[PDB]
């Protein structure tokens, strides 16, 4: 059977295997692909030669080594069958007609696999691309503007002769465009075209082989396009944005303007730019939205998305010597961001949040580039950041959650410029101070910005015991200063500061980290109960499991002992049915770093769960609630269970206390609402034994693995992020003595519930608390199969 | 044999498992725990056949039992301590930049490599005689009469099928014989679930596959085209419905380049005889099902020229002999 | 028997024997068994707690699904 | 839009958003109450905090005298308290003229109680955030308590407690009603039956009171009071003489 092994190789890639034997296994699927007369699951058979052909399985490319290592395939094979969708005479008889979606999907697919195996059509058989050209024109009529067009776009291979180039045939695409008025049925191929070309004479000008039979296309002003070429599709692009709104995905309308650059003869192009941002200027306003919003929010994203496409295709060749002059300057990001900041700004203020976070995940990009302007950017998303903190945007929702975006897009990168970083830890326990119990939604954003923040800093004492230190004194006075300076219309260039007291407000400013984590634990607590639901409750974990791995043992040492603190002396479980998940799991994340501290954690929740019961909680029976004199014991009991699937070794310590606790809490509490919570007390014991998993995951080892104390941004842009020695994960491998224990449990706990089973086979039909007993031993039963899963072999029975 | 590897502790098929007494140990303990299964099914429908709550704490103990083997399934995604991959990796990845992870985040990564490595080990086996009973077992549930109970055994049936091979066949031969007897016992509604079953995804699509068999279903599912008294008749419609649009058969020699073959040709001799062997079976198992299509025509036109009169699904035949009185790939006109 | 020896040696997958060597050898242009041109930054594999297949391994399976791939796709 | 969060009526999973916030409210003034049932009494204990030394005790109460037999104690802003106060006041007045007898304890309840209904249920006016705790000594019915809550509801309680650690103390009582195995307080004279309500609150509580943390009303036949100043005091200093 065909499609089974098809597949079994797909999970092969994940290895490796010799270019000679790609060559062969893409040259089975390119004409496997093609076949007609039977069921045929093509995407899976298109897929495979897309992936085998992928153009970047981690900064390799597939494509350049199957054309150097001799690959070649049929176009007429190809071509043949895209054709079959022309007007076959006698009606009788044609088989695929566009419009009825079995068939467009079809010839969608063609296209597309075509479009993969361009590039392997034969470079020399000369007159591959005169004579296919010669034959699809002569097909163009009307009736065929449809399926012929997107056809050339994708199976016609872009060549480059001595006296026949591709180029060749433009004057002949300006012919159709420029006719029609804007039309997305038409134009669309259009960009795809003089745009996936002229990235590809850039591709091929740089580091590779400058050629292909002719650097005989010459680059210069605008691309490899005219001058009126050029002028033509810039008013087309203003009539998209501002009349006609005939776009789809942008990604591919904006390449023709990205690859038409040339860094060393721009000049001509900006000036055309420029005054297509100030054409378009006014309609991203934030209370001018039409037709237009989406239009200008999707190009002004996926052109800057296809720009720093480039640069980092650019940036990654000038790490192999090739300048070329061709590329893009320094000076280019610089009238980047001249252009598209007023714009950018207007745009994340808009009143729908999609078409919002469209415009704010632009900063993001143009950060990348470090460009002389990046003040310009750091200076606006901290204005409207630090007024919006200072209430001044009160009586304006859109701002405040606004200016929030902004700058969470813009964490990471604010983490390194040597003197924004220092505001981060006044911004942080500012945004934990400020997190509503009201508003969701700000919630929402700034648990963004809280988890950010952390994900890129390490939360730690730097100071070396510097008496100065405090953080008014000497963090305060700085950062109100900066602020100052950048309000009143000046920038951050103009701001002079002693790289002494710049660097005493950035040691002093990681003071703070204590008396802020006291404040975020007391925020979780009051979060524990409010109806914020789901999404967000994760969310909160992900940001209260990052703050924990950012932490160096001196600070997480204390965060585990206000853990411990809060959880047992609260008065915060009351409202009904609480997030329980918002404290039990961040308790376990302490446990996966430290396992000593469990022995103790464990045997308090014990001492306190054999306390509840004895006092009456579960005696009062109901499905479908939680009864409200329980929610403590409910507390304690998921505490236990998710803080036993991370004890891992360090349960073998109080390994008999707890197997015959287990029990007891088996014999005692019948409650079918709490038995589908008692029972997961087994599993998270078993899983705890033998699953195989991660331990560590904190931003910097062992509190000593230095690096040094320079390591904020965590190591993210400089390449040591990755040596081995930095990477020193833990790890939880089972041990011979914890599979031993392991299976003690399996079967102790096995024997007891068939027996109390078995027992209660001596049938009352009546009883209902017997319906719950037998249901208690099944989920038990259950759960210890689970878990305890990982000991099973798919295959005994063979054997 | 062996390609996934996940540490599984007893040693990665060397049976260097095989001669380890921990190894016995822990499957003699997962066959009694079968065997009680079934020991407490049995004792159920026998003592509490008016019960669901029992029945779906069982049925989900079975859905583990058969499923969380080599990984852990149910319970697989459920927010545990663990940092998400797919979280971490929207705040740090920036885009046309090769992994700027800070070291949190390679972490899970890698973890996330290890837990996927597990979930790869195909689980897919042959039944194991118990396991072939407590199988028969959740089929009798998803045969059941109520919906509080035939609704989760149904899909507790799917996760089984996934697990076993051929296991559709099990079912189907239990499904038709008890479904044929659920008509000639009167106007059951163990005919609404029966039909419930075959509308199931897997199901229904395995059904356009099964030559021999739709034979004698068209058959069943025509005579169950009675509202006898039920929602019956109307499922009944539906079903014989889907299927003609199933079905067919590819005589057709793959207009194949030829080269979509012996890329991959094996130096071996005429060792690949073979393939021109199995061209050859794999052509009359083909003859055979387009024979009994033929087959099932012409016992249909029985049933619509000899019935003096059914009424209006007169449909599903002409529906049908057309998508194949006129297919091709064969068809004796 | 060797049966196996010829058909990996037609599939360009008879693999050096030493790892040292073969994992030099799979980023090596001017190598037989040349398979990528990018060393992973991130070699995923060699940070798990255990030992991975063998890279022979790897390739006698691969073969039995070329192989059956292969029957597969001519049989039809 | 998402506007089924601010008005009464259904979200999608049959929820009153509005009304279940309004519950929330009741615990604004984070003031406790218990209420006991005697052999032939009925009495609520209610916590005074004064904070503001500005403030006249004397004005400050969350005990309401509806009429001649009935109390009322309210959990919830002192507002929202006094516009349901006024409005039980007025519809026992009522009942008393138009039917001829005192207004029983549990008919004013299920008449707040359908008045908290409405609310529920129209557009334009919002649930009140009280939950109103109505004590009596009923001519047919015996020692009577009746709570109603914003959400409609009412229904009639051995004894009960409202508020922020509600549930503390009311585990309390549930575990001396396990032990007597009876619906009510077996002592006869009322103070005895102050003195044990004070007590198990000061168990549930974990904190001591003085004469001015606390706020008694006591109902008898033909009369329903409030405890002054130094009747408490008298209560209190009868605890720590045996205890």
């Not at chain 1, 007429?76 to 008889?93: A, G, K, R, S």
């Not at chain 1, 203003?238 to 995905?249: A, E």
């Not at chain 1, 007891?752 to 038990?780: F, T, W």
């Not at chain 2, 030829?258 to 071996?268: R, S, V």
């Amino acid at each position: 059977n065909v499609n089974h092994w098809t597949n079994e190789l797909k999970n092969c890639l994940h290895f490796d295997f010799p270019v000679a034997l790609r060559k062969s296994l893409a040259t089975v699927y390119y004409y496997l692909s093609l076949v007609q007369g039977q069921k045929v699951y093509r995407q899976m058979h298109v897929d495979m030669f897309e992936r085998l052909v992928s153009l970047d399985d981690d900064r390799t490319q597939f494509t350049e080594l199957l054309q150097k290592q001799g690959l070649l395939l049929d176009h007429q094979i190809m071509l043949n069958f895209l054709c079959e969708f022309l007007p076959y005479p006698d009606p009788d008889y044609a088989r695929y007609e566009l419009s009825s979606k079995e068939d467009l999907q079809l010839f969608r697919l063609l296209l597309k696999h075509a479009h993969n195996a361009k590039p392997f059509f034969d470079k020399s058989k000369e007159s591959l691309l005169v004579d296919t050209m010669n034959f699809l024109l002569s097909s163009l009529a009307p009736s065929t503007m449809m399926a012929v067009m997107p056809i050339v776009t994708s199976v016609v291979p872009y060549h480059y002769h001595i006296h026949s180039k591709i180029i060749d045939y433009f004057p002949f695409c300006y012919s159709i465009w420029s006719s029609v008025s804007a039309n997305v049925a038409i134009d669309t191929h259009m960009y795809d075209f003089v745009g996936s070309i002229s990235k590809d004479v850039h591709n091929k000008i740089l580091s590779s082989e400058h050629e292909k039979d002719v650097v005989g296309v010459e680059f210069g002003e605008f691309g490899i396009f005219t001058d009126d070429q050029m002028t033509f599709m810039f008013n087309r692009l203003q009539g998209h944005l501002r009349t006609d709104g005939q776009i789809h995905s942008y990604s591919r309308t904006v390449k023709p303007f990205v690859y038409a650059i040339n860094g060393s003869k721009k000049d001509r192009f900006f000036e055309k730019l420029v005054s297509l941002a100030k054409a378009i200027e006014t309609f991203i306003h934030p209370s001018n939205n039409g037709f237009w919003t989406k239009p200008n929010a999707k190009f002004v994203h996926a052109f800057i998305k296809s720009y720093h496409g480039r640069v980092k295709y650019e940036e990654d060749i000038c790490a192999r010597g090739v300048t070329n002059g061709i590329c893009l300057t320094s000076f280019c990001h610089e009238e980047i961001v001249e252009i598209f900041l007023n714009i950018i700004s207007l745009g994340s203020q808009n009143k729908n949040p999609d078409i919002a976070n469209y415009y704010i995940s632009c900063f993001a990009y143009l950060l990348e580039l470090d460009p002389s302007n990046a003040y310009l950017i750091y200076d606006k998303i901290l204005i409207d950041l630090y007024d919006t903190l200072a209430d001044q945007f009160i009586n304006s929702r859109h701002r405040i959650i606004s200016s929030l975006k902004q700058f969470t897009r813009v964490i990471r990168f604010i983490v390194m410029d040597k003197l924004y970083r220092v505001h981060i830890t006044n911004v942080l326990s500012m945004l934990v101070s400020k997190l509503d119990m009201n508003d969701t939604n700000l919630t929402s954003n700034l648990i963004n910005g809280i988890v950010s923040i952390a994900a890129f800093i390490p939360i730690q004492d730097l100071t070396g015991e510097d008496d100065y230190i405090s953080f008014e004194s000497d963090t305060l006075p700085l950062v109100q200063q900066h602020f100052y300076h950048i309000k009143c219309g000046e920038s951050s260039k103009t701001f002079r500061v002693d790289d002494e007291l710049l660097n005493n407000a950035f040691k002093a400013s990681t003071t703070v980290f204590q008396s802020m984590l006291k404040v975020y634990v007391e925020k979780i607590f009051q979060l524990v109960d409010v109806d914020l639901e789901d999404s967000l409750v994760t969310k909160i974990n992900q940001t209260t499991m990052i703050l924990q791995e950012s932490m160096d043992d001196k600070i997480f040492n204390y965060f585990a002992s206000l853990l411990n603190r809060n959880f047992w002396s609260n008065d915060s479980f009351k409202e009904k049915d609480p997030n329980y998940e918002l404290v039990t799991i961040p308790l376990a994340a302490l446990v996966r770093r430290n396992n000593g501290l469990s022995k103790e954690l464990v045997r308090t929740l014990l001492f306190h769960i054999k306390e509840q019961i004895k006092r009456g909680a579960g005696s009062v029976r109901s499905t479908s609630e939680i009864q409200q004199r329980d929610v403590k014991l409910v507390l304690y009991l998921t505490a236990l269970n998710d803080v036993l699937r991370n004890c891992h070794e360090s349960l073998l310590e109080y390994s008999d206390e707890l197997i015959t606790f287990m029990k007891y809490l088996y014999d005692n509490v019948t409650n079918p609402p709490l038995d589908v919570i008692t029972s997961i007390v087994i599993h998270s014991a078993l899983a705890t034994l033998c699953t195989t998993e991660i331990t560590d995951c904190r931003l910097f080892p062992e509190d000593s693995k230095i690096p040094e104390k320079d390591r904020w941004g965590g190591l993210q842009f400089d390449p040591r992020r990755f040596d081995k020695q930095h990477l020193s994960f833990q790890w939880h491998v089972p041990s011979s003595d914890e599979i031993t224990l392991s299976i003690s449990i399996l079967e102790s706990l096995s024997e007891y519930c068939i027996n109390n089973v078995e027992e209660l086979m001596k049938a009352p039909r009546h009883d209902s608390e017997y319906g719950d007993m037998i249901q208690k031993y099944v989920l038990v039963m259950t759960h210890t199969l689970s878990g305890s899963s990982l000991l099973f072999d798919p295959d005994f029975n063979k054997y | 044999l062996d390609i996934y590897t996940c540490n599984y502790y007893f040693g990665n098929t060397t049976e260097e498992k095989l001669q380890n007494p921990n190894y016995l140990n822990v499957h003699r303990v997962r066959a009694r725990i079968g065997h009680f299964f079934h020991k407490l099914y049995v004792f159920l429908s026998t003592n509490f056949e008016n019960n669901t709550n029992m029945f779906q704490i069982l049925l989900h103990g079975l859905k583990v039992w058969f499923t969380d083997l080599g990984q852990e399934t149910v319970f697989n995604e459920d927010p545990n301590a663990f940092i998400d991959v797919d979280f971490l990796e929207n705040v740090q990845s920036l885009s046309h930049v090769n992994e700027p992870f800070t070291r949190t985040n390679f972490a899970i990564r890698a973890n996330s490599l290890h837990q996927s490595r597990v979930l790869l080990h195909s689980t897919n086996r042959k039944a194991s005689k118990l396991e072939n009973l407590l199988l028969v077992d959740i089929i009798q549930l998803a045969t059941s009469l109520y919906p509080d109970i035939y609704k989760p055994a149904q899909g507790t049936l799917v996760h089984c099928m996934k697990q076993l091979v051929g296991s559709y066949g099990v079912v189907i031969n239990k499904i038709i014989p008890s479904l044929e007897k659920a008509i000639k016992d009167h106007d059951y509604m163990k005919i609404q679930v029966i039909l419930n079953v075959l509308l199931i995804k897997k199901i229904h699509r395995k059904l356009m596959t099964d030559y021999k068999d739709i034979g004698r279903l068209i058959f069943l599912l025509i005579e169950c085209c009675r509202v006898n008294e039920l929602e019956i008749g109307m499922y009944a419609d539906k079903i014989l419905t889907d299927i003609v649009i199933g079905i067919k058969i590819p005589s057709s020699v793959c207009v194949i380049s030829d080269q979509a073959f012996l890329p991959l040709a094996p130096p071996d001799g005429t060792i690949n005889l073979q393939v021109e062997a199995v061209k050859l079976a794999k052509k009359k198992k083909r003859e055979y099902y387009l024979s009994l299509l033929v087959d099932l025509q012409d016992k249909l036109l029985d049933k619509l020229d000899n019935e003096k009169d059914m009424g209006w699904k007169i449909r599903m035949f002409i529906l049908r002999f057309v998508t194949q009185i006129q297919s091709n790939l064969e068809s004796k006109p | 028997t060797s049966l196996l020896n010829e058909r990996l040696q037609h599939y360009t997958l008879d693999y050096v024997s030493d790892r040292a060597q073969h994992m030099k050898n799979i980023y090596d242009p001017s190598s037989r068994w040349f398979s990528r041109s990018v060393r992973p930054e991130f070699p995923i594999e060699e940070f798990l707690p255990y030992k991975t297949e063998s890279h022979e391994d790897q390739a006698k399976y691969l073969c039995h699904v070329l192989v059956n791939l292969y029957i597969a796709i001519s049989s039809l | 839009a998402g506007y089924d969060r601010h008005i009464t009526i259904f979200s999608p999973e049959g929820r009153l958003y509005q009304v279940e916030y309004a519950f929330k409210a009741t615990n604004q003034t984070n003031i406790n109450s218990l209420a006991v049932r005697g052999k032939d009494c009925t009495v609520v204990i209610s916590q005074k905090k004064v904070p503001d030394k500005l403030l006249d005790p004397t004005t400050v109460s969350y005990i309401f005298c509806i009429s001649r037999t009935i109390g009322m104690v309210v959990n919830g802003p002192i507002p929202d308290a006094r516009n349901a106060a006024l409005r039980a006041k007025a519809e026992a007045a009522e009942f008393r003229y138009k039917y001829g007898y005192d207004m029983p304890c549990d008919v004013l309840a299920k008449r707040m109680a359908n008045l908290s209904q409405i609310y529920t249920q129209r557009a334009y006016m919002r649930p009140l955030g009280v939950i109103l705790t109505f004590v009596s000594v009923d001519e047919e019915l015996g020692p009577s308590i009746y709570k109603t809550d914003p959400a409609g509801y009412y229904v009639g309680y051995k004894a009960t407690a409202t508020g922020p650690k509600q549930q503390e103390i009311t585990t309390n009582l549930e575990n001396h009603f396990k032990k007597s195995k009876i619906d009510h307080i077996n002592e006869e004279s009322w103070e005895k039956v102050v003195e044990f309500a004070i007590t198990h609150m000061i168990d549930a509580l974990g904190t001591e009171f003085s004469k001015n943390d606390l706020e008694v009303g006591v109902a008898t036949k033909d009369k329903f009071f409030t405890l002054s100043a130094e009747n408490i005091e008298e209560r209190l200093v009868a605890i720590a003489e045996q205890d």
